[PDB]
Every structure is written in C-alpha cells, then in structure tokens.
Design a protein around this ligand. Structure first.
Ligand code: AAG
Ligand code: NAG
Length: 246
C-alpha cells in the first residue's frame, strides 16, 4: 500500500508519495530506461491501495489497477464506490469487500464522462495540494456531481503525476495555491497511451516513432515528438502502458 497525508504536506512529502506510488507498480523490464507496466496481473494483486488523508486526518482508500494506473474505486468509512465500467466491477470482486454497502457511481472513469458529470472540462478545474485535500473531503460523503470534479482532481494529482515528472512538478508548484492545469499538462495526459505505444514501437525501429506524437510544450507551443531522444522520453515520462493493453 502507499499513503499520503495532507496535514503538514509540502513539495518534498508529495514527491516522496509520488515516488512510493511509482515504486509500488510492478515491472519486469524497462524500455529505454522507463519501467514497462505488466500486460496483466491476476486476482487481488492487480490492485494497489492508496491511503489518502485530508488535513483533518479523515481518510479514503483508493484502488488503482497496477497495469495501467487507472483508479477503479475507493472506500470511504464503510461504503465503497466504483466506476460504472467492467474493469471496476471486476475490481469490486477483490477490494473493499468488507464495506457495509457498495455504490456504483453513475459514470465511468474516463475523462470525457467525468467532465460531463462535473459540468466542466478539466481546463477549468483548479488542481494542487489544496484541491486534493478538498477532493478527499468531498469523497467522504456521497454526492455524485461533486464527486466527478473531486475524481478529476484526484486522478491528475496521483496517477497523472506518477506517469509524468512534469505533472508531479506542476503539482508541487501548486502545494499551497491551486491553479488550473497548464495546456502542456492536458496534452501529456491525453498522450500517455500514444507515447507509451510509440516508445515501445521504437525498439525495433532504431529509437524512431512509427507515428509522431503531437504535444503542447511548457510555453503553450505545439510540438512534434518523433524519437526517443526527446526530453519527453529521456526525462519526463515515468511509466509505460504495455502495448498489449493498447
Ligand atoms: C482516464 C484516466 O487516466 N483515469 C483515471 C482512472 C479512470 C478509470 N476508468 C477508466 N479508465 N475508464 C486514472 O486513475 O488514471
Ligand atoms: C529526434 O528527436 C530530436 C528532439 O525532438 C529531434 O531534434 C531530431 O530531429 C529527431 N531525430 C530524427 C532522426 O528524427
């Protein structure tokens, strides 16, 4: 399991949590020195539990699929909640089985469904450590509209920061002031599957992408990624979705 406490949180303690989250995900190989997530994991071992504590010390446990860093559901006191999708209903067979009741949320976990439920795109939702504290708080008591926004904050400040060093640093910059994500952040989230596949196809192709990946940069400038020498590959990306899952 891994844990993160908002009470006393700072850039350093958040970076330690994101390092523990990355290190909790199993891999048997690295591709261009980046851990390659597993094709598959059977049974309960598929799910990592992340224990998150709001500033007041209240807690939710979040279940994360270790092959793709997708959040499946979470437990808040005696109630479990899962996305309305087959992968999450499968997870509910393995995790939080001791909850007194299980609520299926009225959306799946992908960004488009969640933004629809929340009533706003994530370009307009501030993220940061204070937003994460609010999110854990929201999740403690069911409210499906409020929870959609909370889950957009939670996915970006946990999974997306584990996947990209750039996003982890964006959150660290927001340790004590929220701010909506940079266009570069949104670009990277949206590109993780694309990138993961092209970095894997590059082995066998002399480090060269079969298909270029188009990204927005730190300056709001639109750029093209064609090979593994790009900073996005050498420095930023931290985990690769296995092509078997693409
Ligand atoms: C879209 C995204 O990355 N999402 C979340 C998890 C969402 C789980 N559900 C589906 N993917 N359908 C994450 O934790 O990363
Ligand atoms: C590889 O990527 C780098 C950095 O983005 C770029 O400068 C270069 O032109 C690319 N090389 C090839 C052979 O495409």
């Amino acid at each position: 399991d891994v844990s993160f406490r908002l009470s006393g949180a700072d850039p350093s303690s958040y970076g330690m949590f994101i390092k523990d989250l990355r290190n909790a995900l199993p891999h048997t190989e690295k591709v261009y020195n980046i851990p390659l997530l597993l094709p598959s994991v059977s049974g309960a071992g598929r799910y990592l539990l992340m224990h998150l504590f709001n500033y007041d010390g209240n807690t939710i446990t979040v279940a994360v699929d270790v092959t793709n860093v997708y959040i499946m559901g979470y437990l808040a006191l005696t109630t479990s909640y899962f996305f309305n999708e087959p992968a999450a209903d499968l997870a509910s067979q393995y995790v939080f089985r001791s909850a007194r009741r299980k609520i299926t949320l009225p959306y799946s976990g992908n960004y488009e469904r969640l933004q629809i439920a929340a009533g706003k795109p994530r370009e307009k939702i501030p993220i940061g450590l204070p937003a994460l504290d609010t999110a854990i708080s929201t999740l403690l008591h069911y409210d499906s509209t409020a929870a959609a926004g909370a889950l957009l904050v939670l996915i970006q400040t946990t999974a997306e920061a584990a996947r990209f060093k750039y996003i982890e640093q964006q959150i660290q910059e927001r340790a004590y002031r929220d701010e909506v994500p940079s266009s570069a952040t949104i670009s990277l989230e949206n590109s993780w599957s694309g990138l993961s596949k092209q970095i894997q196809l590059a082995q066998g192709n002399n480090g060269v992408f079969r298909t270029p990946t188009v990204l927005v940069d730190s300056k709001g400038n639109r750029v093209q990624i064609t090979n593994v020498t790009s900073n996005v590959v050498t420095s930023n990306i931290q985990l690769l979705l296995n092509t078997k899952n693409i």
